[PDB]
Amino acid sequence: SNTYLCPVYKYPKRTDKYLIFRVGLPCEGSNNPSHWKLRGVALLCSTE
Amino acid sequence: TMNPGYAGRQELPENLKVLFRGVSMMVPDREIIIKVKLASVGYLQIDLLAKKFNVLYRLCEEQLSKQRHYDFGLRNILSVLRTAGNTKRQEIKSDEEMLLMRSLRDMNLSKLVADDIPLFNGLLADIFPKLKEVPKKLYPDVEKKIPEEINAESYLINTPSFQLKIIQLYETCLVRHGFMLVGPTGSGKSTIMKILTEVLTKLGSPHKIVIMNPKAITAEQMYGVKSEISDDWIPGVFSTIWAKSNNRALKHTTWITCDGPVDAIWIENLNTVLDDNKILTLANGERIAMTENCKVVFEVENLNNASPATVSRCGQVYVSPTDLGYEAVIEGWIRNRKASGRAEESDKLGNILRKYLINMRFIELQSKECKEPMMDTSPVISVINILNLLTGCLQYFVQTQRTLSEQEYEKFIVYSMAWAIGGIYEAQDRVRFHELLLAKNAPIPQKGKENETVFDYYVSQDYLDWKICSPEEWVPPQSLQFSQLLLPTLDSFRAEMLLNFILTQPKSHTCSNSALLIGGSGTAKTSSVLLYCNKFDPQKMLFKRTNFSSATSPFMFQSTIEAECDFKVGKEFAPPGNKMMTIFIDDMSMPFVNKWGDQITLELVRQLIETGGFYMLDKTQRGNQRKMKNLQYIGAMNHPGGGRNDIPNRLKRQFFIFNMILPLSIEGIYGPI
Amino acid sequence: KPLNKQKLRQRKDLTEEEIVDIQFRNRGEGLENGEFYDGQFWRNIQGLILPHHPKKDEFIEEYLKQEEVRINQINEQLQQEWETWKQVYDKI
Amino acid sequence: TFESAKDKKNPALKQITQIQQVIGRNEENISLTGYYVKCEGNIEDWLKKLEQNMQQTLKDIASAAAQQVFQVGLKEFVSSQASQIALLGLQILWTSKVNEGLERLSRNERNAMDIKRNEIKEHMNILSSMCLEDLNGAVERTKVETLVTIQVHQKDISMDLKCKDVNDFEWQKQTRIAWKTDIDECIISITDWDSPYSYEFLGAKERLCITPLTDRCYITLAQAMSMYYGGAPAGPAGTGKTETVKDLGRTLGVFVVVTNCSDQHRYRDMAKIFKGLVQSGLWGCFDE
Amino acid sequence: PDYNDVEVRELVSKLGGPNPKTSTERGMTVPLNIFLYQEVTRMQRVIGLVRKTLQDTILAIDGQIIMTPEILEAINAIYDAKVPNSWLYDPSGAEISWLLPNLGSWSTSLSDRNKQLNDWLRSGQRPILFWLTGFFNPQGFLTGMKQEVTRNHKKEAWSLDDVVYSTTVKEREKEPAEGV
Ligand SMILES: Nc1ncnc2c1ncn2[C@@H]1O[C@H](COP(=O)(O)OP(=O)(O)OP(=O)(O)O)[C@@H](O)[C@H]1O
Ligand SMILES: Nc1ncnc2c1ncn2[C@@H]1O[C@H](COP(=O)(O)OP(=O)(O)O)[C@@H](O)[C@H]1O
Numbered sequence A: 001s002n003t004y005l006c007p008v009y010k011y012p013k014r015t016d017k018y019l020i021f022r023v024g025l026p027c028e029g030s031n032n033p034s035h036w037k038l039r040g041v042a043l044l045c046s047t048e
Numbered sequence B: 001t002m003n004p005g006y007a008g009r010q011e012l013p014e015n016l017k018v019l020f021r022g023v024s025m026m027v028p029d030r031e032i033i034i035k036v037k038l039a040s041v042g043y044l045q046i047d048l049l050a051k052k053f054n055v056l057y058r059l060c061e062e063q064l065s066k067q068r069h070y071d072f073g074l075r076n077i078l079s080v081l082r083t084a085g086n087t088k089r090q091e092i093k094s095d096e097e098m099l100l101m102r103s104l105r106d107m108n109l110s111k112l113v114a115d116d117i118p119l120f121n122g123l124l125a126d127i128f129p130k131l132k133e134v135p136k137k138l139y140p141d142v143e144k145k146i147p148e149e150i151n152a153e154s155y156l157i158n159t160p161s162f163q164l165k166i167i168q169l170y171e172t173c174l175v176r177h178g179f180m181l182v183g184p185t186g187s188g189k190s191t192i193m194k195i196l197t198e199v200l201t202k203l204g205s206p207h208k209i210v211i212m213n214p215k216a217i218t219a220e221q222m223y224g225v226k227s228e229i230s231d232d233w234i235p236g237v238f239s240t241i242w243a244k245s246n247n248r249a250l251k252h253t254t255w256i257t258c259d260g261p262v263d264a265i266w267i268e269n270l271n272t273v274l275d276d277n278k279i280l281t282l283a284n285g286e287r288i289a290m291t292e293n294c295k296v297v298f299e300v301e302n303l304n305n306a307s308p309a310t311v312s313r314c315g316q317v318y319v320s321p322t323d324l325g326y327e328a329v330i331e332g333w334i335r336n337r338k339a340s341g342r343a344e345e346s347d348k349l350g351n352i353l354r355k356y357l358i359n360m361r362f363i364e365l366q367s368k369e370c371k372e373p374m375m376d377t378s379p380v381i382s383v384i385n386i387l388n389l390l391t392g393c394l395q396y397f398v399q400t401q402r403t404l405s406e407q408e409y410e411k412f413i414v415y416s417m418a419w420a421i422g423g424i425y426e427a428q429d430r431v432r433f434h435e436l437l438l439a440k441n442a443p444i445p446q447k448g449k450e451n452e453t454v455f456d457y458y459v460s461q462d463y464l465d466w467k468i469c470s471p472e473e474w475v476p477p478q479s480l481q482f483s484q485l486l487l488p489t490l491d492s493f494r495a496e497m498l499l500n501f502i503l504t505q506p507k508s509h510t511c512s513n514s515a516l517l518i519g520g521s522g523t524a525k526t527s528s529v530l531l532y533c534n535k536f537d538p539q540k541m542l543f544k545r546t547n548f549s550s551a552t553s554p555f556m557f558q559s560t561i562e563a564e565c566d567f568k569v570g571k572e573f574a575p576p577g578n579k580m581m582t583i584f585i586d587d588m589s590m591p592f593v594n595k596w597g598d599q600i601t602l603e604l605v606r607q608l609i610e611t612g613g614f615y616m617l618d619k620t621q622r623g624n625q626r627k628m629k630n631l632q633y634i635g636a637m638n639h640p641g642g643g644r645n646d647i648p649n650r651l652k653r654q655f656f657i658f659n660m661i662l663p664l665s666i667e668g669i670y671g672p673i
Numbered sequence C: 001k002p003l004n005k006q007k008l009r010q011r012k013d014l015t016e017e018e019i020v021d022i023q024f025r026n027r028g029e030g031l032e033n034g035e036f037y038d039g040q041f042w043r044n045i046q047g048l049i050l051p052h053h054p055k056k057d058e059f060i061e062e063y064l065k066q067e068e069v070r071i072n073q074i075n076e077q078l079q080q081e082w083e084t085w086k087q088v089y090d091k092i
Numbered sequence D: 001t002f003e004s005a006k007d008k009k010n011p012a013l014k015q016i017t018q019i020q021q022v023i024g025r026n027e028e029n030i031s032l033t034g035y036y037v038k039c040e041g042n043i044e045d046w047l048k049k050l051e052q053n054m055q056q057t058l059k060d061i062a063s064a065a066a067q068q069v070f071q072v073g074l075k076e077f078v079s080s081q082a083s084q085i086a087l088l089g090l091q092i093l094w095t096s097k098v099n100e101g102l103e104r105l106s107r108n109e110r111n112a113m114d115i116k117r118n119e120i121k122e123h124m125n126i127l128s129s130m131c132l133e134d135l136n137g138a139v140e141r142t143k144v145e146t147l148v149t150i151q152v153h154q155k156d157i158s159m160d161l162k163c164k165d166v167n168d169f170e171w172q173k174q175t176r177i178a179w180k181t182d183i184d185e186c187i188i189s190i191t192d193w194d195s196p197y198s199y200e201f202l203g204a205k206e207r208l209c210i211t212p213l214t215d216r217c218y219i220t221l222a223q224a225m226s227m228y229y230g231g232a233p234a235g236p237a238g239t240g241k242t243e244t245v246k247d248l249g250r251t252l253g254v255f256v257v258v259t260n261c262s263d264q265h266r267y268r269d270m271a272k273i274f275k276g277l278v279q280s281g282l283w284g285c286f287d288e
Numbered sequence E: 001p002d003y004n005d006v007e008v009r010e011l012v013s014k015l016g017g018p019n020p021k022t023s024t025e026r027g028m029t030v031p032l033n034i035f036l037y038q039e040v041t042r043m044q045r046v047i048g049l050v051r052k053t054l055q056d057t058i059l060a061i062d063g064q065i066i067m068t069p070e071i072l073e074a075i076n077a078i079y080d081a082k083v084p085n086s087w088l089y090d091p092s093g094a095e096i097s098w099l100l101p102n103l104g105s106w107s108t109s110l111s112d113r114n115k116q117l118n119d120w121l122r123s124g125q126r127p128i129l130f131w132l133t134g135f136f137n138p139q140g141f142l143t144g145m146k147q148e149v150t151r152n153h154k155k156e157a158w159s160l161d162d163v164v165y166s167t168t169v170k171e172r173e174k175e176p177a178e179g180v
């Protein structure tokens, strides 16, 4: 359970729609994944 | 159970959001339900098969082509399950996965357009590689019965595509409440329904069919409302048919057919009837329970204003343009020609027709430029048109019982199809057309052809000649500009020439006996039409005039036609309407197109032309229709495109359409006066 | 006399609709381009019905060869029968 | 049925003696009555008596059936009783036996909880083997797999049901039932909420599977009803809203009345509906 | 310019494969070729509409036609930053490439999409470094990759429902096998 899972949104509007796929991103160090979850990271596609 | 966000959906004012507590149901589970249902039937390969179902339906949803009418939700899945009970209940102990592949594939074939079928079954192969193929379980009685009545009719050619589509319709009828026949114009939908009803009736178990047009009547009238004057209820048409149909202790099996567009506002309040509740509910407070005696069908062209809440409620079947090619229709007409005029004509006429039509029509659309076909169309309409013209062409020699050589017939076909594919083009495109016909077709006039097109001349009944003229005629002595009504032009005479042929034909199948001109605003529309109309004989042939504006409603057109006939000529009435009448309209375009794109006035006309009659609205009785046993119809267009509207495409199949150019001779119109 | 009949491409080879349907139902091979299930209908490319299996003729030839061998088996049995009748009869 | 009882000098009065639910043509379910209902001069009277006497006989047949369930054994009472009572019997058996196992665990480390779970597992094979493959009639058919689906979910929960005692949340998450004897009455239970069975004859109805999402709805709606509100679920089309509502109605013994609002409505008819709802005791589901 | 389907169907049928060694040229069978055809189809559907409406917007004043309300809305949108609604939405929904500027990014994005799609077609060779934003339906791309791996590799040893997904981030600036 050391692995963190991110979404991939097409537009930066961020709804249920536009969720293409989900990506595991293990790179943790000292900060547990919930830190990142509250931080609301994401891998969007466009930039607007 | 509100539904967040569509067309025609308001919000709850904040006084009312207080009471209710929310429950967010976005994604249902789909695997556990399937596996426990398969357990409930009593299968043994549960857990693998469940994953198979889920993955197949997912993949089909995402990576397949996007079409509006496709659905793969839970309604489809449950339909498959309630199907799959019986197959295991049958004696076979064969391996379950075979039975299941067969069930899924054979269920989901019907809706798919041409291209998606290879992708679908290529996708099937990637999940059941153990299984190679299975035959489709074929029902012997119906497949042997179908050709019998297809031969019983005169004008019916059996083709394999019809077998496939009609059997698919039979299966979806067997499973689900209601269904839709999505597919483009002139594709044979109504015929398919009719023939199916016939085969069901042949082996006992009768079947009756009713028709309706939803956007040629107002929804308030369709389901009835409370009167807005006297504070008292009025009955609703569709609900009256419902109550009249779902009585037990009958022998029919009624199929209520709606026929028009699918706009969300009127359809969507039938969710309860099309859902598993299968109960109708009214604002009256009246609740009527469905029976198995009744089914609901829609002969609609295609959905473009439908939310999934109505796509997923009912099954569906897709007709394609290539299922019934225009050639098959030609062969049906040929079968009719060998009915009575069977001396040699079918063979002789066609011996040019087949190659002269198959290997020619597609070399006119864009082989040569032809880049201004003012009326965009599908070419089957052109074929119906030329056939209807040719029948009128040969009507005279049918009358005298005279049979002609091959060469005269070839000339006749050249003349027939010169117009009716040349009727939608301008002089430049017409000369390019003419050069094509010179290059690779049967002879056109060559005696003089002094910078005059093939259109200019006509074939004469008395002999094989290409001449034309306009007879001299001056005026009466009166000096009113009206008394100087109109003069005998060339354009008018050729217009009468074309019109009269169709207008003499006596109500053949594929003939509505209806015409339509196209010309610019101020290009001799009412002129030529009125020149024709004066020539009527009011002792056995009458006439009526009407005009169109944007805010003319179906109730207005209803009123004028009712006042025109003044009688219900269906119930053995109208001595004075026994003479033949004509309805003339200047401009069918102008009525206000609705926001969606589907105008709501022409539909009354289309139910008048196609079938004659309509439903009454006189606050006394509802489910019943007046009948027109005799009428005639003529129209006139204004060069549609750009700012000018266009008519519904479903309606284009019936009217003879052709251009009305400017005269280019106006030095010679005003000479006499 | 007693004897068997020779096969023929003209008459004996004439396949009945039942024979035609079963032979097509074998659906052995020949789908080099790539064709779909023969369970109901063959389709060339995108949902387009084919009047017949593409290379049907080779299957006809193979079945004719097999049937000629079968007729040779019937003729061999008939030859044994005819020779037996001749052998028994000639003694008297 | 209508049986004429010939009163002296009065024309014989027709009285009801049994009730029937017909589905299809010949397949049907019959229910006798010991308490009878007699026609009269006032229509409201014999309609009211029909309702009451139905409720009373349903209650008494259930009160018996709850003893018969554990006395006779699985097959006999499932074959003997009607569908509604059969499903109630299965649920009450399972909750009582599972309870008994849980206390027996509380006393000391015991296999008896495991023996009860094994008993349910054994019941599964006998129900699944025979009554599913061969059977006569549509109504009788629908009854069986209605039992089967419940039992599948039943054993699936009971496999992983690692709760030490009744107070544990994992046990206090499902729709349990208790037919109280000392005060003779049904009572259905959720996390906290409780309510009595409403005794409406429905016969065999095709109730549905229980995904976890349906559990979320059940808990939510029980809570909302405990605070005197009305659930208003939402989402996209075809996710099981109306049918989930109807099933929570069906399991609780009540009768639901779906309607269909549309733009051509007026508040007088809604008032009529709501007056009927408050007067009767029924549930409303204003679809769309 | 447009891409006529009589040419495009040809060109897509002429060349296609996951790996030149693994398979000879082919059309329908390989998922990425059918994806090429679908994407070209939708792209042309938008290209025709834009060309036509620009024309008929300018052919009302310099040209002649009875003025439309839609065309007036288009004129107003062209003056402002926002593109007209005619190129984003439809009565139900037809989202294409909704970006802010009239031409600063919108037509820029459409041009880039068509450029990559053409070089993905005219040469016909599969380039490296696919641009995910350009595809109208990204998910079909990924599931086609799945199907490709199932067929080409471990075929059958691997079933479609057995396969699961994962990703390794190429932690490198400076740089085929399965994946994209
Ligand atoms: N078996 C057949 N053989 C020859 N011609 C046929 C056959 N079946 C149908 N046709 C012809 O096809 C046409 C049927 O068109 P149809 O009225 O079915 O169109 P539709 O699919 O109902 O759409 P719409 O209602 O909009 O016209 C008629 O011209 C009919 O003569
Ligand atoms: N044969 C004719 N003789 C005399 N005048 C004619 C003739 N044909 C057309 N005109 C004149 O040309 C005009 C054309 O108008 P019209 O065709 O009625 O408009 P629209 O084409 O919109 O129906 C008429 O008003 C008529 O006076």
Ligand SMILES: Nc1ncnc2c1ncn2[C@@H]1O[C@H](COP(=O)(O)OP(=O)(O)O)[C@@H](O)[C@H]1O
Residues within 6 Å of the ligand: B001, B028, B033, B074, B075, B078, B275, B276, B309, D208, D209, D210, D211, D214, D236, D237, D238, D239, D240, D241, D242, D243, D244
């Ligand atoms: N958990 C479930 N078990 C069984 N069937 C279900 C389940 N969820 C949804 N369904 C099916 O979905 C259909 C009901 O959909 P419905 O709730 O009417 O859609 P909507 O909520 O949009 O009206 C029924 O066929 C029902 O059986």
